[PDB]
Write an enzyme that holds these catalytic residues in place. Sequence first.
Site, mmCIF file in Angstrom:
data_model
loop_
_atom_site.group_PDB
_atom_site.id
_atom_site.type_symbol
_atom_site.label_atom_id
_atom_site.label_comp_id
_atom_site.label_asym_id
_atom_site.label_seq_id
_atom_site.Cartn_x
_atom_site.Cartn_y
_atom_site.Cartn_z
ATOM 1 N N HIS A 1 0.794 -1.220 0.000
ATOM 2 C CA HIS A 1 0.000 0.000 0.000
ATOM 3 C C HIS A 1 0.834 1.281 0.000
ATOM 4 O O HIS A 1 0.307 2.365 -0.217
ATOM 5 C CB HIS A 1 -1.076 -0.019 1.088
ATOM 6 N N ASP B 1 -0.178 -7.526 2.266
ATOM 7 C CA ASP B 1 0.316 -6.176 2.162
ATOM 8 C C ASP B 1 1.829 -6.182 2.288
ATOM 9 O O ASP B 1 2.393 -5.990 3.373
ATOM 10 C CB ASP B 1 -0.332 -5.313 3.231
ATOM 11 N N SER C 1 3.540 2.673 8.253
ATOM 12 C CA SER C 1 3.230 1.492 7.451
ATOM 13 C C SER C 1 4.424 1.096 6.639
ATOM 14 O O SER C 1 5.224 1.950 6.235
ATOM 15 C CB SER C 1 2.083 1.753 6.488
ATOM 16 N N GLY C 2 4.544 -0.208 6.414
ATOM 17 C CA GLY C 2 5.648 -0.729 5.648
ATOM 18 C C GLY C 2 6.873 -0.977 6.497
ATOM 19 O O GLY C 2 7.789 -1.688 6.070
#
Length: 231
Positions: free
Chosen positions: A40, A85, A177-178
């Site tokens: 994402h 993801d 995120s990530g």
Amino acid sequence: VIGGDECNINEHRFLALVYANGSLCGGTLINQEWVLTARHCDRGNMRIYLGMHNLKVLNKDALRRFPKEKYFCLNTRNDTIWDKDIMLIRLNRPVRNSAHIAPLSLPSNPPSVGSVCRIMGWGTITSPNATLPDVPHCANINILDYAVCQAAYKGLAATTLCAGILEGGKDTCKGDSGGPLICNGQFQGILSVGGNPCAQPRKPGIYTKVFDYTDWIQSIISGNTDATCPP
Ligand SMILES: *[C@@H]1O[C@H](CO)[C@@H](O)[C@H](O)[C@H]1NC(C)=O
Ligand SMILES: *[C@H]1O[C@H](CO)[C@@H](O)[C@H](O)[C@H]1NC(C)=O
Ligand SMILES: *[C@H]1O[C@H](CO)[C@@H](O)[C@H](O)[C@H]1NC(C)=O
């Protein structure tokens, strides 16, 4: 990261800063040429910064890279949230080990429920309302019983870890995120999704479960053609 403090400048040598279309993410350098992040985070014109700590006091060895190869799982569910993801990126040029750069490799096993994990990122340190730090913040959280995330969330993706503090107070948040979930010194999770506002009681973070993707990662990087993601 909510409820943490500035990371030690030396404790995150594998942590990548991922900027795409003004959007902030983390990533993890898994060897000298490849970074794992959340799919994402692929929001366009990705710039990947290695060896960064303070965004306003650049480490001498900080480097900028961009994707030369980019992979993710083609078969994703539509009914679960950000299924699979994960995105594996080969950098345009290798980054050698330096004071602030070194890879974190693939876990030998998935983490036990109850394990202490480090979370880290340049994401907001307040939620609601963004407060972006100049330095990455770090906190300790735990691997939680997956049922906790199942109870808290709607379409929870499989191949994920549920991690946080059951009582809340410490959590990743927007911009993280990530980034990696490091449990007992192992790269175990990539932050995918969580509750908003962040750090609420019983609303943990959902981290793509890196262990489950070992074969996929190794297949891609080792060059054998069109690997497949785990179910
Ligand atoms: C699946 O959900 C996504 C939400 O990201 C949405 O963009 C898409 O329209 C959905 N897929 C289908 C079958 O339309
Ligand atoms: C950039 O791309 C992301 C993809 O998610 C999107 O959310 C955002 O609106 C885009 N920015 C611009 C310039 O519209
Ligand atoms: C930011 O959003 C939250 C509600 O989501 C609210 O507490 C606040 O009023 C908003 N902005 C500020 C800092 O006033």
